[PDB]
Amino acid sequence: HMKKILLVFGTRPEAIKMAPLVRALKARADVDAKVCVTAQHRQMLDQVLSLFDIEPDYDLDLMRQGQTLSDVTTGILHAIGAVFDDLRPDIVLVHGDTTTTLAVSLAAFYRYLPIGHVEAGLRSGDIWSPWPEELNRRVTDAVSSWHFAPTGQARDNLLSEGVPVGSVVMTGNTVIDALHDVKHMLERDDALSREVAARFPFLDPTARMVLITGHRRESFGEPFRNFCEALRTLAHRYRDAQFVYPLHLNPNVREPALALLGGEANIYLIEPQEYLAFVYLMSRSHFIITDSGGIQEEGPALGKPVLVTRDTTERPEAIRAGTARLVGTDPELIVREASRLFDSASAYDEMARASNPYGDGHASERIVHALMHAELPLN
Ligand SMILES: CC(=O)N[C@H]1[C@@H](OP(=O)(O)OP(=O)(O)OC[C@H]2O[C@@H](n3ccc(=O)[nH]c3=O)[C@H](O)[C@@H]2O)O[C@H](CO)[C@@H](O)[C@@H]1O
Ligand SMILES: O=c1ccn([C@@H]2O[C@H](COP(=O)(O)OP(=O)(O)O)[C@@H](O)[C@H]2O)c(=O)[nH]1
Numbered sequence: 001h002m003k004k005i006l007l008v009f010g011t012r013p014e015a016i017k018m019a020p021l022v023r024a025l026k027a028r029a030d031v032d033a034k035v036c037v038t039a040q041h042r043q044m045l046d047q048v049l050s051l052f053d054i055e056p057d058y059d060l061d062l063m064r065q066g067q068t069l070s071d072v073t074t075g076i077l078h079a080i081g082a083v084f085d086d087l088r089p090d091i092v093l094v095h096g097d098t099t100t101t102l103a104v105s106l107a108a109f110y111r112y113l114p115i116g117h118v119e120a121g122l123r124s125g126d127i128w129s130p131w132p133e134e135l136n137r138r139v140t141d142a143v144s145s146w147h148f149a150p151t152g153q154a155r156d157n158l159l160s161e162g163v164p165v166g167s168v169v170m171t172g173n174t175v176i177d178a179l180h181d182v183k184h185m186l187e188r189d190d191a192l193s194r195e196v197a198a199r200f201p202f203l204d205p206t207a208r209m210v211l212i213t214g215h216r217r218e219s220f221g222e223p224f225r226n227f228c229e230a231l232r233t234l235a236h237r238y239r240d241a242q243f244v245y246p247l248h249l250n251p252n253v254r255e256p257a258l259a260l261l262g263g264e265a266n267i268y269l270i271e272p273q274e275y276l277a278f279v280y281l282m283s284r285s286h287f288i289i290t291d292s293g294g295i296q297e298e299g300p301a302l303g304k305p306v307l308v309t310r311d312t313t314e315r316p317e318a319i320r321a322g323t324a325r326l327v328g329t330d331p332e333l334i335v336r337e338a339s340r341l342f343d344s345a346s347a348y349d350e351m352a353r354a355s356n357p358y359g360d361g362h363a364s365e366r367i368v369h370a371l372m373h374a375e376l377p378l379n
């Protein structure tokens with residue numbers, strides 16, 4: 001294990017997407033693969049670590065209630081050095097577009113430590129949307145020595161920014177690897193599938209289900225309030241449908257969600273769900289309403305219509321294919337688009353088409369090759 005590879009990540013979406021790559025690298029006897037978590041998230045990170053049986057070698061222990069962007073940035077810069085010093089890695093792998101990604105990349109760049117960016121080249125073209133994720137991925141890509149692009153379009157973004165062609169490997173997105181792994185867990189074990197389903201005894205098998213998440217930082221405040229009012233209007237219009245909403249732990253969305261949506265009989269506010277259960281819910285859903293990046297990739301892959309509650313996106317493929325539509329946080333538009341999917345089975349069939357531009361679920365192997373060769377509702 002001469003080559004030392006340090007994988008670093010901090011949040012739920014990074015952990016899910018990095019898990020298959022961690023597994024692949026740890027399995028090898030000619031790589032010394034180590035994991036450092038920044039713990040930018042705690043519970044939402046731990047849910048992933050436990051599911052995929054990943055015990056980090058280092059944990060920077062950073063999360064505090066109501067932390068700021070500056071808190072996370074400084075926390076990482078202060079604490080990561082001891083990790084770099086202890087291991088002396090040959091390469092640092094970072095993921096995606098969180099403040100963890102940014103701060104780890106800066107720290108490594110400052111020390112001439114080569115960085116590989118898993119999920120490289122996604123762009124909205126707007127430094128204020130998503131905020132600060134667009135900045136985070138742009139900085140990371142500027143300083144990275146390998147760029148693992150999930151699509152040809154992301155590759156093209158990098159090349160247009162002056163990234164050398166030899167640095168960019170179009171590998172697809174490891175989220176497909178993770179999704180397939182979990183889909184298999186469910187399909188291959190009926191006992192497991194039964195247990196997962198039994199976590200949601202409030203679900204009615206005869207009722208259509210809509211699955212909801214929301215946490216984009218630029219949407220805090222008024223846009224989120226409008227999104228919640230749209231959900232209320234929909235819940236009132238479709239009293240026979242069930243609206244299942246796994247909350248996010250960020251207080252800026254958890255508290256208003258509870259305050260605004262807590263009194264509706266057919267809105268089920270639940271805790272953030274471990275990925276196994278969440279894939280079950282996505283698969284069960286009639287459609288999805290979300291501003292999540294990863295769900296914009298997973299939903300269309302599962303053939304589920306996605307109403308994207310953003311005014312822009314860095315995942316254009318599903319939009320172009322029709323399986324996702326941008327609805328922003330305009331209540332009238334959200335209600336209109338959701339209502340069409342309930343009211344028109346022909347609209348639903350026209351929209352519910354599998355779309356996956358992200359590869360065959362073996363992105364992790366391609367990255368490795370490049371480098372080496374019951375739930376109770378809240379009320
Ligand atoms: C700037 C940045 O990197 N934002 C990422 C972060 O946003 P997110 O909204 O989670 O922002 P933070 O990671 O800064 O967490 C904010 C606050 O949420 C609460 N909290 C969060 C996680 C947890 O496990 N327990 C907990 O209590 C804490 O009060 C914490 O201080 O994670 C999201 C995934 O979910 C990503 O889409 C975002 O890109
Ligand atoms: O309750 C939930 C909500 C989301 N996810 C998964 O979390 C990833 C997306 O993370 P998130 O939406 O928090 O952030 P983003 O992708 O927008 O950065 C995807 O793999 C989702 O399937 C999950 O496991 N449980």
Ligand code: NA
Pocket residue numbers: 025026027028029030031032033
């Ligand atoms: Na190993």
